[PDB]
Amino acid sequence: EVGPALFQSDMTFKIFIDGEVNGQKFTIVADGSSKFPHGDFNVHAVCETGKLPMSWKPICHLIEPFFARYPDGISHFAQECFPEGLSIDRTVRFENDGTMTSHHTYELDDTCVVSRITVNCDGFQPDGPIMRDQLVDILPSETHMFPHGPNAVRQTATIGFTTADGGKMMGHFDSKMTFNGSRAIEIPGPHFVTIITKQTDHVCQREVAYAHSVPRI
Fold this sequence. Notes:
The protein is an all-beta fold and 217 residues long.
């Protein structure tokens, strides 16, 4: 069995992130589970050191597109990529601040999706809210997913973070997901994924994610 058939039960996941911010290495390990039907799920993450050398808020999207809830009419690319797995190359660019670039690899190990991520967070401003841990809230996002050739998709978004003094920081998210196998895969048509996020040296994070389309003219 392949694709979403591998996703018809309760599942777990593991994430290993090898990072740096402004040349300071960090590493994060996180785990969680996603009940079927998938869509509303938690992750628990922790870093090696006592105090992550950046805000935890920007880490939110590094710590599971295959666990988004999809209606029947929209193909669920990330689920279709299994068992062979997928890659993600991604950039999130903060206005007036740094850029985080990541490469991700996901594998399925029975009912556990294991992810390996390297991420470079460069150019972050030491007097800014991310380096000063002054982001308080991760705001809901409407991501947009498009076809990108016969074996990939591209997902763009803006992610908003409220700051301690009532402002906002906007991160510009651009992400390519790529199938690591050779078989044919149904590439979904353009659509949106709504992602609502709530985050609490360690962190709990809840996400609610669901696919939808909008009327055409």
